[PDB]
């Protein structure tokens, strides 16, 4: 099946060890769009992409996916349908190089122009990448890894895109160019759920966004309007 919606969480409850995470949550990430969760570090935003990814259990709720679905289905599973995820701490391979690494996420493609295409895609928006090609990982700055771990997940042609926190640690021209580079991706049609505690960034960049706070959504709406809104200002642009 294929939805307008392609992930809809409808009342998420998620418990792990002594601690009521996420209290029954509901977010749509409509295809095409940029759909960004934000809100203060703790709020449960890493614990909600988790569930989505079957990484955590949901003891409540469904996580719906292109109308299937999917909730405590198996990560392995739920990735091989087209959820790819760019966790937090710019996981990469430092042995491979950064050709080894972004060819990587291609490994179930078949795909023989289709996966050219994308390579020379990837080059077009991460300069510096192509730049070291045949350079090992670990061998990056923190910014040019993280762009690594986004482009292997690009080579895998997401059917959602999922990302937690990209722009953390960067300086300011990184966290700029990142932010660019995810509107970039959607322009071509990739469907982005973006978690970020950098909200002004991820607000700019975002169709859609929802604030949560202490597991549970207080507010959503359009992304311009939650620029304008005064509470989302004071409490997470510092507008007091
Ligand atoms: N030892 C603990 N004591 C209290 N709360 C804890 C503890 N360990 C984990 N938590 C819970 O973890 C949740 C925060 O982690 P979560 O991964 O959801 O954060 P986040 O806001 O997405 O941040 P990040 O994206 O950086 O991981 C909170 O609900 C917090 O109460």
């Given at each position: 099946m294929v939805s307008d919606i392609v992930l809809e969480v409808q009342s998420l409850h998620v418990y792990y060890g002594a601690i009521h995470a996420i209290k029954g949550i509901d977010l749509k990430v409509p295809r095409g769009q940029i759909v960004t969760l934000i809100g203060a570090n703790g709020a449960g935003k890493t614990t909600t992409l988790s569930a989505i990814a079957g990484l955590v259990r949901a003891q409540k709720g469904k996580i719906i996916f292109n109308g299937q679905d999917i909730t405590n289905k198996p990560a392995h599973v739920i990735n091989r349908m087209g959820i790819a995820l760019v966790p937090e701490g710019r996981r990469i391979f430092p042995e491979l190089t950064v050709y080894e690494n972004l060819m990587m996420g291609a490994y179930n493609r078949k795909d023989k122009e289709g996966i050219k295409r994308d390579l020379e895609w990837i080059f077009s928006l991460f300069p510096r990448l192509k730049e070291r090609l045949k350079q090992l990982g670990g061998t990056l700055s923190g910014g040019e890894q993280q762009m690594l771990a986004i482009g292997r997940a690009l080579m895998s042609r997401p059917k959602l895109l999922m990302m937690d926190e990209p722009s953390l640690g960067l300086a300011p021209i990184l966290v700029s160019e990142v932010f660019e580079v995810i509107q970039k991706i959607n322009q071509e049609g990739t469907t982005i759920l973006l978690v970020e505690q950098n909200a002004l960034g991820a607000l700019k960049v975002a169709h859609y966004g929802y604030v949560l706070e202490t597991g549970q959504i207080?507010?959503?709406?359009?992304?311009?309007?939650?620029?304008?809104?005064?509470?989302?200002?004071?409490?997470?642009?510092?507008?007091?």
């Open positions: 207080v507010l959503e709406g359009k992304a311009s309007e939650l620029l304008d809104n005064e509470m989302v200002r004071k409490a997470y642009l510092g507008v007091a």
